[PDB]
Structures are given as structure tokens and as C-alpha cells.
Amino acid sequence: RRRLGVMGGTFDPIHNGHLVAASEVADRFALDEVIFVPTGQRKVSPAEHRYLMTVIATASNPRFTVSRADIDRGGATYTVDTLTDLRTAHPDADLYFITGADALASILSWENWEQLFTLAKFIGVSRPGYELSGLSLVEVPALAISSTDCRIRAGQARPIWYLVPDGVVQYVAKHRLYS
Amino acid sequence: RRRLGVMGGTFDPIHNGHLVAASEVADRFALDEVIFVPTGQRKVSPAEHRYLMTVIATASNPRFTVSRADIDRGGATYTVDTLTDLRTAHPDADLYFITGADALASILSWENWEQLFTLAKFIGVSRPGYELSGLSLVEVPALAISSTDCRIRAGQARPIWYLVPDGVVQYVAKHRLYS
Ligand SMILES: Nc1ncnc2c1ncn2[C@@H]1O[C@H](COP(=O)(O)OP(=O)(O)OP(=O)(O)O)[C@@H](O)[C@H]1O
Ligand SMILES: Nc1ncnc2c1ncn2[C@@H]1O[C@H](COP(=O)(O)OP(=O)(O)OP(=O)(O)O)[C@@H](O)[C@H]1O
Ligand SMILES: [Mg+2]
Ligand SMILES: [Mg+2]
């Protein structure tokens, strides 16, 4: 069966932390594809901008794609809705939902994760400054990067080079996203 | 006076840790340029390959250039020789020698650093897993990346995406540098 990575995120902006994590997981579980899924709509940049920055970010990687499913569904994004639609859209694939330590704790604490485990294999990945502890835990390269830090840098005219892809650096400057 | 960053390195390969560090320093001290200087000739990849990967890596950044001075001098690279030649090649500029915590300790422990401080301002930067303590100490984004780890990944056919620039990922694959 086809092995599809899934990685949800606000992606405001997508950064090298998100991308290095997806790439490690893709290697360790021999995934054919990773679909990045921008969440639907602290100011959150419009959905279309977050979507496009994600297409630009993932463009160069032969295995990474983007779904606009969550942004098009409308309203709030729940993990169950994301995976169910992906199950319907890729009936013959095995889904691997990729999630960093903070968002994993949140799913385990606040969602019916037993149901979620019936829709996909869960791959919890490490993130600097958080505690990682049917579900698999993987250590990915330690890149202490948050979108928050990027948004603060962009607003203070401080550089986000080498924290996000060159495409995202350009895209943030051109559309003036966080100033 | 013109403010020139200088960053020496083996650059085998250059990675996002090196580049994010140079970029932070460039912002904090309003540098006009950062010159990356590959050291002259554990197998170290030929000088020309390390040089080119550095040109490719720094290409997209308007403020980053490369000097082939150290690789062309011949023999072993000493910090004093690097800075003296840069002083001669850019007589009217102020040099800022950029160096991570491990290489800083090594210079302070093993070289006549008082002389070196007469040729340039020293900017010690943080690196994960090392202790940072005329000289300035700056915290740069924490990206736990080493060329060593990249070389080991490349040799085991494991991905170095988002640890090095896309150009370096391509360049390592094409010339098969560490396999
Ligand atoms: N540096 C990182 N390394 C690994 N996983 C990360 C990293 N940053 C975020 N993640 C994971 O990426 C997913 C989406 O994160 P999210 O969109 O909130 O990004 P973010 O960097 O945390 O932005 P923000 O700081 O605005 O919350 C989550 O599963 C989260 O755990
Ligand atoms: N992740 C990093 N963040 C900040 N500085 C770094 C980082 N990696 C290396 N440096 C600095 O880059 C300069 C050159 O390092 P070098 O060429 O030895 O790279 P490296 O990553 O340590 O490779 P190797 O692992 O083969 O020693 C030094 O001043 C070093 O302290
Ligand atoms: Mg977050
Ligand atoms: Mg080193």
C-alpha cells in the first residue's frame, strides 16, 4: 500500500523545522509522499497566503505536496476532519500523521485520539523546548525555530534567512506579511 | 568605514547553521558584506568542491560573498594569515571575524588571539552543544547542525534537505561527495 505522510500546520510561515521534520519521517518510514495541509482560518495571515508559502516551500522536494482541503472546508480545523477527508481522497493509501511534541500532547490531552489512530499512524517528532513522551516517536534534527519567532523577526525588519526557505523569505518581503 | 563580516570554515558541507549565524551577525552589527572563506587543505573534500558549494550556498543572499584566498595560499590555514590577507585586500574596511563557540575556544586556547584582535573585531556566536563564554558574544538561532552529521547522512543515503541549502543538496548528489 502507498505510504502518505500528512503534516497539518498553520504554516504562518512554514519553516525549516517543519520541513526537516517531514523529511526525516519520510526517510525513516519510506514514505512516497508527504502532503502538507494548511489549517483553515494573534492575527493569522489569510489562508491563501499560508497555502502559497507552503507550495513555494515544498516545491523543490520531489516527495512533498500541499492539500488545500482544510482551508476549503471552511471554519475550524479538527484532526478527525482532516484525516477522514484524506481517507476519502486517497482510499488505497496508508496515512501517517506527522506531529511535533507540543501538538501531540494537545491531541492526546484534548481529542479522541483512539478514533484518530484508526484513521492513521501517528508519528510524533521532537521539537526543541518540548517533551516528547499505533504511535511512533522519532528524533528529527533539532532546529529551534517557530513561526512566532519568524513573525516577530519579519515585523522588526530582522532577517528570517535560513530559518525558512529562500522562497518564503522572498514571499514574506514581497507581500509584507508581518509588518 | 565599510563593515565586512568574515567567516572561515571547512565548509564540507556549508550548512544552515553556518548561514543563519552569519546572517544574525550581519543584522546585529549592520554589516555590508559577509565574506565566507573556505579553509585550505577524516577525508576533507577537495578545495574546489568546498569553494563551489559555498558560492552556491551564498549566491541568493545579496550580502554574502566567497573568497578563495585561503584555498589559493596553499598549505594550512591560520587565522592570522586569513585576516592579514583580508586586511591587505580590503585596506579601507573594518573586519568582523565570525566564529562559533567551539572554534572560539580553540583560538583563545591555541592562538595568539591578542594579535588577532588587532586585525579584526571578533564575533563569537552560539552553537548548540557548546559553551559560549574587542570580542562580542551574540546568540544566533539554535540549529543543531554539523557538517559531520551531514557527511554521515549523505554516506548512508539519508536526506540532508533543510540542513543545507537546496543548492548544496543538489551539489552533493550530483558530485557524490560523501559516498
Ligand atoms: N521546529 C519544529 N520542529 C518540529 N516540529 C515542529 C517545529 N515547529 C513546529 N512543529 C510542528 O509543526 C506543526 C505545526 O506547527 P505550527 O503551525 O503551530 O508552527 P509553529 O512553528 O509552532 O508556529 P507558532 O509558533 O505560530 O505556533 C505541529 O505539529 C508542531 O508541533
Ligand atoms: N550550527 C552551527 N551554528 C553556529 N556556528 C556553527 C555551527 N556549525 C559550525 N559553526 C561554526 O562554523 C565555523 C566553521 O565550522 P566547520 O567548518 O568546522 O563546520 P562544522 O559544522 O563544525 O563541521 P565539522 O562537523 O566537520 O567540524 C566555526 O566557527 C564553527 O564554530
Ligand atoms: Mg505552534
Ligand atoms: Mg567543526
Side-chain angles (χ1 to χ4, degrees):
Chain A
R1 305 194 77 194
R2 193 169 166 75
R3 290 159 85 130
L4 293 187
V6 179
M7 191 174 203
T10 291
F11 301 134
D12 194 12
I14 192 161
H15 59 69
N16 290 340
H18 298 153
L19 298 154
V20 82
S23 168
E24 190 67 21
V25 167
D27 174 74
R28 306 305 291 286
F29 292 85
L31 303 178
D32 305 311
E33 214 180 326
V34 180
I35 309 190
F36 289 73
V37 194
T39 49
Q41 300 289 116
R42 175 68 165 99
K43 301 178 184 175
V44 175
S45 298
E48 195 63 8
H49 286 304
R50 295 180 299 101
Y51 176 64
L52 289 189
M53 285 190 292
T54 305
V55 170
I56 292 165
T58 58
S60 67
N61 195 295
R63 294 190 196 280
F64 293 179
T65 59
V66 197
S67 176
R68 61 175 303 118
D70 287 2
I71 69 173
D72 284 331
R73 190 160 45 250
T77 293
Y78 299 92
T79 310
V80 67
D81 290 301
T82 302
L83 293 173
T84 306
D85 287 356
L86 292 177
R87 285 284 311 286
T88 308
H90 303 259
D92 302 320
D94 283 356
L95 303 174
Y96 291 74
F97 193 78
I98 306 177
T99 197
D102 61 297
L104 182 56
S106 177
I107 290 156
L108 295 182
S109 306
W110 307 113
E111 293 172 57
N112 186 354
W113 58 266
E114 276 180 0
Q115 169 184 39
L116 297 180
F117 282 27
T118 78
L119 311 178
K121 298 220 209 325
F122 272 61
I123 310 297
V125 300
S126 56
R127 185 177 184 176
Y130 297 90
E131 200 206 348
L132 195 67
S133 71
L135 166 74
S136 309
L137 308 175
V138 177
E139 293 290 297
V140 312
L143 296 197
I145 306 182
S146 64
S147 301
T148 295
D149 187 57
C150 305
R151 287 190 301 275
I152 293 169
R153 286 171 166 268
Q156 297 178 347
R158 290 163 59 223
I160 65 174
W161 286 93
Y162 321 116
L163 300 169
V164 306
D166 288 12
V168 182
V169 185
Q170 295 155 12
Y171 194 93
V172 166
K174 185 193 291 189
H175 301 273
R176 295 150 295 182
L177 281 195
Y178 315 114
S179 52
Chain B
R1 305 194 77 194
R2 193 169 166 75
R3 290 159 85 130
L4 293 187
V6 179
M7 191 174 203
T10 291
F11 301 134
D12 194 12
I14 192 161
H15 59 69
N16 290 340
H18 298 153
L19 298 154
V20 82
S23 168
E24 190 67 21
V25 167
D27 174 74
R28 306 305 291 286
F29 292 85
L31 303 178
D32 305 311
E33 214 180 326
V34 180
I35 309 190
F36 289 73
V37 194
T39 49
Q41 300 289 116
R42 175 68 165 99
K43 301 178 184 175
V44 175
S45 298
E48 195 63 8
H49 286 304
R50 295 180 299 101
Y51 176 64
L52 289 189
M53 285 190 292
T54 305
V55 170
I56 292 165
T58 58
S60 67
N61 195 295
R63 294 190 196 280
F64 293 179
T65 59
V66 197
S67 176
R68 61 175 303 118
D70 287 2
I71 69 173
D72 284 331
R73 190 160 45 250
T77 293
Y78 299 92
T79 310
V80 67
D81 290 301
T82 302
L83 293 173
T84 306
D85 287 356
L86 292 177
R87 285 284 311 286
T88 308
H90 303 259
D92 302 320
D94 283 356
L95 303 174
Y96 291 74
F97 193 78
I98 306 177
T99 197
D102 61 297
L104 182 56
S106 177
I107 290 156
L108 295 182
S109 306
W110 307 113
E111 293 172 57
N112 186 354
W113 58 266
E114 276 180 0
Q115 169 184 39
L116 297 180
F117 282 27
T118 78
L119 311 178
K121 298 220 209 325
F122 272 61
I123 310 297
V125 300
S126 56
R127 185 177 184 176
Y130 297 90
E131 200 206 348
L132 195 67
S133 71
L135 166 74
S136 309
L137 308 175
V138 177
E139 293 290 297
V140 312
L143 296 197
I145 306 182
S146 64
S147 301
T148 295
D149 187 57
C150 305
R151 287 190 301 275
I152 293 169
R153 286 171 166 268
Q156 297 178 347
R158 290 163 59 223
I160 65 174
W161 286 93
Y162 321 116
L163 300 169
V164 306
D166 288 12
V168 182
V169 185
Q170 295 155 12
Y171 194 93
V172 166
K174 185 193 291 189
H175 301 273
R176 295 150 295 182
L177 281 195
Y178 315 114
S179 52

